[PDB]
Amino acid sequence: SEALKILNNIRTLRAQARECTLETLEEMLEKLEVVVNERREEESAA
Amino acid sequence: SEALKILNNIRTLRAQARECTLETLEEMLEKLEVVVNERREEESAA
């Protein structure tokens, strides 16, 4: 879980976002939303 | 940008999410939303 722990420090991701375009940032937000929604389905099923 | 490129592969984040609780996943989604919104402000200003 090295990529999940980095998401907790926004300042670190802030420096990484400065080297990427907005279109790549939109795709990254989609994947994180699906990952949280995937766990939401397991929480709603239990 | 090692944490930003990992977010593109949801299957990889999928295995990492299985080892964390939903509360930690909610905070991670907040940071990514703020990172994308921070770049949105720069795009709207330009």
Swiss-Prot record, chains A, B:
Induction: Protein levels rise from about 4,000/cell in exponential phase to about 18,000/cell in late stationary phase (at protein level). Subject to transcriptional auto-repression. Induced by increased hydrostatic pressure. hns transcription can be repressed by overexpressed StpA (which is usually repressed by hns). Induced by cold shock (42 to 15 degrees Celsius) (at protein level). Cells (strain MRE-600) in mid-exponential phase have three 15.5 kDa proteins with 3 different isoelectric points; the major form (H1a, pI 7.5) rises in concentration during growth while the 2 minor forms (H1b, pI about 7.2 and H1c, pI 7.0) remain approximately constant. It comes from the Bacteria. Homodimer, also found as tetramers or higher oligomers. Oligomerizes into higher-order complexes that form bridges between adjacent DNA helices. The N-terminal region (residues 1-64) can interact with overexpressed StpA. Forms a complex with Cnu (YdgT). The H-NS dimer forms a heterotrimeric complex with Hha in the absence of DNA; this is mediated by residues 1-46. Interacts with Hfq. Residues 20-46 are annotated as: Involved in dimerization. Changing residue 29 to A/K: Wild-type function. The record marks 11 as: Interacts with Hha. The chain holds residues 2 to 47 of 137 of the full protein. A DNA-binding protein implicated in transcriptional repression (silencing). Also involved in bacterial chromosome organization and compaction. H-NS binds tightly to AT-rich dsDNA and inhibits transcription. Binds upstream and downstream of initiating RNA polymerase, trapping it in a loop and preventing transcription. Binds to hundreds of sites, approximately half its binding sites are in non-coding DNA, which only accounts for about 10% of the genome. Residues 21-46 form a coiled coil. Changing residue 11 to K: Abolishes the interaction with Hha. A central region (about residues 21-47) is involved in dimerization, but multimerization requires other residues. The dimerization domain (1-47) also acts as a hinge; changes in its structure probably impact oligomerization and DNA-binding geometries. The N-terminus also interacts with Hha, perhaps via residues 2-18; a well-folded dimer is not necessary for Hha binding. The C-terminus (residues 92-137) binds DNA. Residues in the N-terminus contribute to DNA-binding and to discrimination between curved and non-curved DNA. The lineage of its organism: Bacteria, Pseudomonadati, Pseudomonadota, Gammaproteobacteria, Enterobacterales. Belongs to the histone-like protein H-NS family. It is found in: Cytoplasm, Nucleoid. Disruption phenotype: Decreased growth below 30 degrees Celsius. Altered expression of a number of genes. Derepression of the cryptic blg operon. Alteration of chromosome organization. Double hns-stpA mutants grow slower and have reduced viable cell counts compared to single hns mutants in MC1029 and MC4100 backgrounds. In 0.3M NaCl a double hns-stpA deletion up-regulates 583 and down-regulates 86 genes, 363 of which are thought to have been horizontally acquired; 131 are also up-regulated in a double cnu-hha deletion. At 28 degrees Celsius csgD transcription is reduced. This is DNA-binding protein H-NS. Changing residue 29 to P: Derepression of proV and bgl expression, does not dimerize, anomalous protein mobility on gels. Protein localizes to nucleoid but no longer forms discreet compact clusters.
